Structure 1
Amino acid sequence: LPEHWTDMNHQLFCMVQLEPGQSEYNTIKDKFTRTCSSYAIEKIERIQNAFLWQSYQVKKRQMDIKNDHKNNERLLFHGTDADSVPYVNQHGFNRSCAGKNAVSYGKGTYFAVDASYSAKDTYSKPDSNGRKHMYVVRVLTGVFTKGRAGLVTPPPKNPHNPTDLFDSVTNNTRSPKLFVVFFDNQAYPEYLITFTA
């Protein structure tokens, strides 16, 4: 488990509230405000989930071996409804629970490059107290191609070798604005931003 995490005392899960003025808080706030300057952050919590971390780090090591000298990991945003937050915190991102996206590049979990995309009410639905929720997520994007609405897994790199797959898909390979992942433990929810208008 990462050495800067708070001691959990044999606990496998906890949320840690970050302090404004710490570099850890301030970098997430800057990443968010770059495209969401009109919203205000209530708090940022570090997600310490031992089991999700273990499974994710195993998948990362495998993709680092398979792809050899690629930047396989991106830090991306995911807006969700309050009713989903307890499940994501404990179990991560389940494609079986994902909605149809307004522009579908496949049936998977969607992650945004820009916080502004995730900040739409359609993804970060305001709760009964006007709080919006967005995860900051380590995503194994690996080698990616433009997706298509029919995909249930990423497409093959070569049609004559149907099982050798891209790691993820995007809307545009030249200027990616979203990524779609189709497998469990390909994304680690690292921070939860609670924010308001």
Structure 2
Amino acid sequence: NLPEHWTDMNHQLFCMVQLEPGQSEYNTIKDKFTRTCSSYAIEKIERIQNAFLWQSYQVKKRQMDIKNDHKNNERLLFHGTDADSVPYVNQHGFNRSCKNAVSYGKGTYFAVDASYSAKDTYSKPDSNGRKHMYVVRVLTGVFTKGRAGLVTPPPKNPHNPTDLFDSVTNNTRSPKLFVVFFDNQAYPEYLITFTA
């Protein structure tokens, strides 16, 4: 059940599609980035068409929508990474088992603001100065404040220790980062290649 806005993949299951500047999709993704990264220079934006990752993510989404008994489980967030990680993420998504602060738990970190992900410690500039940031669909669901050393989100009620929050954050009232602890809770939707 591959999304309408995807382009034909000639019966293949993985493709990176460079977006056309000035069309609705490119402008929408560029605006989300330029909200906080207007001083940067965008070289290109690519749509990640990964059928397998999409399938696994949509299954997790449908499960979270049932468990939480609403939609609103999804947020669009940013993730800066190094050039050498880009092929892995494009193909396999985010892996908590793969450096950098993990103060809110041993998961994959997503930023609310592109400017946070634009830090060199996250979107490490490559031998030619290029920086890489994903726009990510994240199943944040019902979240709570994180803490160091978590390997999963805490339980909602320690009377039912296996009924977990879906994600953790730095701050529940005004979140700036989210951490997820399971594969296929995050779909890398766009890759932005940019410079300082």
Indicate the TM-score class for this superposition, using the shorter chain for normalisation: over 0.9
Alpha-carbon deviation of 1:127?
0.3
| Cα distance, 1:103 vs structure 2 | 6.1
Question: Does the CA-based 8 Å contact 2:100-2:121 persist in structure 1?
Answer: no
Task: Please identify, of 100-109 and 180-189, the stretch whose mean Cα deviation from structure 2 is larger.
Answer: 100-109
- Could you list the per-position Cα deviations for residues 137-163 of structure 1 after superposition, in whole angstroms to 9, with x for gaps in the alignment? 000000000001020000000111110
> Which position in structure 1 is the counterpart of 2:110?
111
3-state SS of 2:115 partner: helix
SS in 2 for 1:66: helix
Q: Secondary structure in 2 aligned to 1:169? A: strand
1: distance between equivalents of 2:51 and 2:28?
23
Q: SS at the partner of 1:95?
A: coil
How far the C-alpha of 1:4 sits from its partner, in A, is 2.2
Q: Which runs of 5+ in 1 are unaligned?
A: none
Q: CA deviation at 1:38?
A: 1.0
Deviations 1:109-166 (A, max 9, x none): 0000000000000000000000000000000000000001020000000111110000
Q: Which secondary structure state, in structure 2, belongs to the residue aligned with residue 180 of structure 1?
A: strand
Structure 2 length as normaliser, TM-score?
0.97
The whole-number CA distance in structure 2 between the counterparts of 1:150 and 1:162 is 17
CA distance in 1, matches of 2:71, 2:58: 16
Identity across matched positions, percent:
100
Contact 2:73 2:141 in 1 (8 A): yes
- Aligned partners of 2:101, 2:134: CA distance in 1, in Å? 20
Contiguous gaps of at least 5 residues in structure 2: none
Instruction: Report the Cα distance in structure 1 between the residues aligned to 2:96 and 2:67, rounded to whole angstroms.
Output: 23
In 2, the alpha carbon distance for the partners of 1:104 and 1:126 equals 24
Structure 1 residues 16 and 81: CA distance shift in structure 2, 3 A: same
Alignment TM-score, normalising by the size of structure 1: 0.97
Q: Provide, for residues 74-99 of structure 1, a one-character-per-residue CA deviation record: whole Å limited to 9, x for no partner.
A: 000000000000000000000000xx
Summarize the Cα distance change of 1:5–1:103 in structure 2 as closer, same or farther, 3 Å threshold: closer
**Structural RMSD (CA):** 0.9
Deviates most, 20-29 or 169-178: 20-29
Q: Which residue of 1 aligns with 2:54?
A: 53
Q: Distance in 1 between matches of 2:101 and 2:185?
A: 23
Query: How big is the shift at 1:101?
Result: 4.2
Alpha-carbon distance between aligned partners in 2 of 1:6 and 1:27, rounded to the nearest angstrom? 17
CA shift at 1:5, angstroms? 1.1
Cα deviation digits, residues 11-32 of structure 1 (max 9, x gap): 1100011111111000111110
Question: Equivalent residue for 1:41?
Answer: 42
Tell me the distance in 2 between the aligned counterparts of 1:66 and 1:14: 32
Residues of 2 paired with 1:24 and 1:96: CA distance? Answer: 32
List structure 1 segments (4+ residues) > 2 angstroms apart after TM superposition. 100-103
